């Protein structure tokens, strides 16, 4: 086998055409000698340029450079030969692997279906690498990764003195597979003798009484986090633990997972929220490719640089573009925030089931804006949303008016016979066929390619995108999405953000997006509803307020302050106990866009 790209980098800060004659390059260059364009002259910025499309990689120019402003490398037997696994010809292929490490938290960021999960099975002893050949042994794996830390992994893995435990990419499998209580389960799975510490730090002592099927999202997720650590294993691989956790939970779970590094145990993590990712990890991997054709894991990076580079879409270590535009964000000074017309107003409501109490203070709904809902789970974010939605009748007050409400529920389960196209089509055929919904909603969330399978025959992340798109293609005055964040990746999360923002702004309509992922809030929100009280008991919904004034108000009850990163612009979470943490909290401004 073979395969090879040439990559040329010239440290211009070291080049000086006038000192080496006249671009010693083009002169000494064999290809240019025979009438070729390996090295071209930028007779303006006065620099030399190597057109890697030519350069034989002979390296003559490199040896000649009177300084050493030239490097030419052949990505041979390293990027093409590395090839790890092929599922048979005309089928998915993996290149490279994430490099897990002891005593450290190895991060992963990169869109779904790029064989994140392919690598897990590989590492779990349950799939032998063929190295895109025909192999069915460990030994060729151990050799191929010679010069690297993963050889040592495959040697232990085969002796079988390590076995990694894996928190699966979809959960909601344990309730329909394991019956009885969270109390029970957590005794059973116990083998680590750390039962006390776990259940307490992740605050599942109230959550023991309920049965698995009676859990809400945040709780079910965390109970999996618990049961994975109580199984005995050195290596713990968490695939998407950000699903359905609220803002308060996800920051607290991050601390729990981070404390593992100190115990010297190896954590491998997928996260799709940059603030949570920054905080946990110590290494970071970027994974690039178009889903379902190939995936390649990049070289290990230090968390901060790795994230910067993801945002830029350009790899300077690997020389790969993988997205033709940059990840970007919206402050509050990059907008027009001007007042708009009142759609409706709601008085004081108060709903008591008699197993939770909510009071909603008097509030205004404006037209043409996007209101983010924030707070910890079971604080009746959902109780409010459901009162306008019509599935719950307020005990007192009125919200149920002649606005039509479009409602995306918290769980997703399908009950629909027929295709993705049937399901959408009966709502508004018309919308499907117009160019806007095609630029902003349907096309970048993959739905054009999804019309051929049934709704029941769609998987969690595709089906999520399908629910979301469905709710926004309903004909309504006001759009209600309860927690769409679940099972979306970074790119998806962002695409849904740009779609919500454009569609709502253009037709001047209201939407409520209950939200907990920092980035979506950071882009989309015009106004905020902060929830407080003590969850599972009482909640007090405070009236709508400005985006900044809201995230300020709320962040102060979490102890956790947010900056603006200076490298390429993203929400920077600041470590509890830091300079910035201390300066923000002292000065009553607990947040910056
Ligand atoms: S070799 Fe490339 S870098 Fe060294 S001087 Fe000539 S042009 Fe500038
Ligand atoms: S061989 Fe080395 S120098 Fe000659 S072209 Fe290819 S890269 Fe540039």
Numbering used by the authors: 1 to 593
What did the study's authors say about this model?
In Eukarya and Archaea, the ATP binding cassette (ABC) protein ABCE1 catalyses the essential step of ribosome recycling by splitting the ribosome into its small 40/30S and large 60/50S subunits. ABCE1 is equipped with two nucleotide-binding domains (NBDs) oriented in a head-to-tail fashion and connected via hinge 1 and 2 region. Furthermore, it contains a unique N-terminal FeS cluster domain, aligned by two diamagnetic [4Fe–4S]2+ clusters. Hence, ABCE1 emerges as the missing link between termination and initiation by potentially coordinating the re-initiation via the released 40/30S·ABCE1 complex, named post-recycling complex (PRC), where ABCE1 remains bound after ribosome splitting until ATP hydrolysis has occurred.
